[PDB]
Amino acid sequence: SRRGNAGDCLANPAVPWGQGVEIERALKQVQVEGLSGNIKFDQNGKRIN
Amino acid sequence: NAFCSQFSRGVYAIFGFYDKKSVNTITSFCGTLHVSFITPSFPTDGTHPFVIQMRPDLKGALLSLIEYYQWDKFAYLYDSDRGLSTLQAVLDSAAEKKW
Amino acid sequence: NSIQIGGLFPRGADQEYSAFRVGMVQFSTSEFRLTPHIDNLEVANSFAVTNAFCSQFSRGVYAIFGFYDKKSVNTITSFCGTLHVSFITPSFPTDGTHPFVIQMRPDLKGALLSLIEYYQWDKFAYLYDSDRGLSTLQAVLDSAAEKKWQVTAINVGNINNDKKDETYRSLFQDLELKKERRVILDCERDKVNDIVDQVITIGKHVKGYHYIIANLGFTDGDLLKIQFGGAEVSGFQIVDYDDSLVSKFIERWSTLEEKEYPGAHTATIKYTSALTYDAVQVMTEAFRNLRKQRIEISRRGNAGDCLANPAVPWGQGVEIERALKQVQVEGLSGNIKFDQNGKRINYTINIMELKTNGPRKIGYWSEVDKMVLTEDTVVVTTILESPY
Amino acid sequence: VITIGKHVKGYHYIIANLGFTDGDLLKIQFGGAEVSGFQIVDYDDSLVSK
């Protein structure tokens, strides 16, 4: 769900909004095919296989 | 400038390119502000959260191709702009395999 | 006239922060003074650098002193390139003509290159760290081809703390099969103390080897444990203690308080702290020379934040770097002379070599002339007869 | 011996007392000098292992 306000990036100290953990985790689990070939991701984010 | 302006918009992910000058800038922010970044540029040495690399590695294919062609003496020409991580890999394998 | 400046200091930089205080106390003149406004941080994280640099620019200063790392150097050279705030630092010198940047550290490469032909080497190894950039490794391999060396360069910096002892024993036994009697090290203090301890434990400091610790502190780290092996050790240092102003400083430095000045009550001082003292003389030289030609640059108006769209400079900062680069004073290192870019010219490095008595000096180096071997025979009579 | 550097391959040492592994020994394990010694208490015995 979109939080609405985001604030300023240079907030001292700024606070992360803890939905981006669920964003990247689905991003790390993408298993599709593209022009290059098979696309498989490590939990680091490096392209494997 | 473009990072905080798009952070003001409240975006979900950021797509873009980086060079060796700005590579530390994105990795410092996306780890801090916990937003994802997806890129076709050259991948960083070491691990970084919140960064998805699209370009694969080239090291092992280079070390296979030199080994498949059975080389021991050659020359190497490099540009600084994409980092030096390929150079550091092939100089380590230079020591182990008598190059 | 309390000129307000800014400090960006890393954690664990205890000896340098006291060496910053000694210049602030001694070089404090009555006609003007300096307001520190110092914050602590981590040098590897650019976000805290992004936090602190826009913190001090939000207040608005005339100059900033601090330390940077390889992981944050382009954060600095982009901000001071854009926002026209001059910057002074003793860290490793950048490559490229970056405006608004003062390199207080001298270059080391040409002095390092000069020593190598002096021993007339041909084949050696080169252990390096990945933290001070790779400018030296690029410098030697470019010179390796055009003067026909055989260099085996091996990185060491990515080794974890838990598996040190197996990796170094894996490292030097690989060097032993190639008969590598000559090693050039290039690290900070803490790696050099770790590497030398593993050289001793495998027993590779007898008569027959040679070592070069290529950094500005040769007697900075511990050296006594390899004094008596037999392996000839050389190194580089700029801060010679034989100078009286240095000897005045050491006499002043030694008598100080531990809990007030952590790391002061010693006999020697590290070069990173030595330039920190020498930088405050250069900062105070600026605003003294600034008020001499009646140049008021007092931008008392509100600086505002750093995220301006578009960002705007303020042209009195051009006069600041005009004043900072035109500084020639004398400090612990010696003759401080600059370039239009911000580098250092006309300096001298003392080539030091290790003997059984301890550290010595076998000469100095310059830009104009190379390694000058200032240490500071029979006549045969016979007659020409065959086959003699 | 270590500080003057005299434990390379080529030397030999014998610590003639009943505790060979009693004192520290790791710091000259990796030199090259062959070191022997004497001990009576073998740990491989079960009553010792008990």
Swiss-Prot record, chain A:
Belongs to the glutamate-gated ion channel (TC 1.A.10.1) family. GRIA2 subfamily. Coiled coil: none annotated. It comes from the Eukaryota. Detected in forebrain. Detected in dendrites of neuronal cells. Expressed in the pyramidal cell layers of CA1 and CA3 and in the granule cell layer of the dentate gyrus. Induction: Down-regulated in the pyramidal cell layer of CA1 in the hippocampus by global ischemia. The chain holds residues 322 to 370 of 883 of the full protein. The M4 transmembrane segment mediates tetramerization and is required for cell surface expression. This is Glutamate receptor 2. Palmitoylated. Depalmitoylated upon L-glutamate stimulation. Ubiquitinated by RNF167, leading to its degradation. The postsynaptic actions of L-glutamate are mediated by a variety of receptors that are named according to their selective agonists. This receptor binds AMPA (quisqualate) > L-glutamate > kainate. Homotetramer or heterotetramer of pore-forming glutamate receptor subunits. Tetramers may be formed by the dimerization of dimers. May interact with MPP4. Forms a ternary complex with GRIP1 and CSPG4. Interacts with ATAD1 in an ATP-dependent manner. ATAD1-catalyzed ATP hydrolysis disrupts binding to ATAD1 and to GRIP1 and leads to AMPAR complex disassembly. Interacts with GRIP2. Interacts with GRIP1. Interacts with NSF via its C-terminus. Interacts with CACNG2, PICK1 and GRIP2. Interacts with GRIA1 and SYNDIG1. Part of a complex containing GRIA2, NSF and NAPA and/or NAPB. Glycans are attached at N49. It is found in: Cell membrane; Postsynaptic cell membrane; Postsynaptic density membrane.
Curated annotation (Swiss-Prot), chain B:
The chain holds residues 75 to 173 of 883 of the full protein. Induction: Down-regulated in the pyramidal cell layer of CA1 in the hippocampus by global ischemia. It is found in: Cell membrane; Postsynaptic cell membrane; Postsynaptic density membrane. This is Glutamate receptor 2. Detected in forebrain. Detected in dendrites of neuronal cells. Expressed in the pyramidal cell layers of CA1 and CA3 and in the granule cell layer of the dentate gyrus. It comes from Rattus norvegicus. The postsynaptic actions of L-glutamate are mediated by a variety of receptors that are named according to their selective agonists. This receptor binds AMPA (quisqualate) > L-glutamate > kainate. Belongs to the glutamate-gated ion channel (TC 1.A.10.1) family. GRIA2 subfamily. The M4 transmembrane segment mediates tetramerization and is required for cell surface expression. Ionotropic glutamate receptor that functions as a ligand-gated cation channel, gated by L-glutamate and glutamatergic agonists such as alpha-amino-3-hydroxy-5-methyl-4-isoxazolepropionic acid (AMPA), quisqualic acid, and kainic acid. L-glutamate acts as an excitatory neurotransmitter at many synapses in the central nervous system and plays an important role in fast excitatory synaptic transmission. It comes from the Eukaryota. Palmitoylated. Depalmitoylated upon L-glutamate stimulation.
Curated annotation (Swiss-Prot), chain C:
It comes from the Eukaryota. Detected in forebrain. Detected in dendrites of neuronal cells. Expressed in the pyramidal cell layers of CA1 and CA3 and in the granule cell layer of the dentate gyrus. Glycans are attached at E232, N346, D376. Disulfide bonds join C54-C306. Palmitoylated. Depalmitoylated upon L-glutamate stimulation. Ubiquitinated by RNF167, leading to its degradation. It is found in: Cell membrane; Postsynaptic cell membrane; Postsynaptic density membrane. Residues 1-388 are extracellular. Induction: Down-regulated in the pyramidal cell layer of CA1 in the hippocampus by global ischemia. Homotetramer or heterotetramer of pore-forming glutamate receptor subunits. Tetramers may be formed by the dimerization of dimers. May interact with MPP4. Forms a ternary complex with GRIP1 and CSPG4. Interacts with ATAD1 in an ATP-dependent manner. ATAD1-catalyzed ATP hydrolysis disrupts binding to ATAD1 and to GRIP1 and leads to AMPAR complex disassembly. Interacts with GRIP2. Interacts with GRIP1. Interacts with NSF via its C-terminus. Interacts with CACNG2, PICK1 and GRIP2. Interacts with GRIA1 and SYNDIG1. Part of a complex containing GRIA2, NSF and NAPA and/or NAPB. The postsynaptic actions of L-glutamate are mediated by a variety of receptors that are named according to their selective agonists. This receptor binds AMPA (quisqualate) > L-glutamate > kainate. The M4 transmembrane segment mediates tetramerization and is required for cell surface expression. Belongs to the glutamate-gated ion channel (TC 1.A.10.1) family. GRIA2 subfamily. This is Glutamate receptor 2.
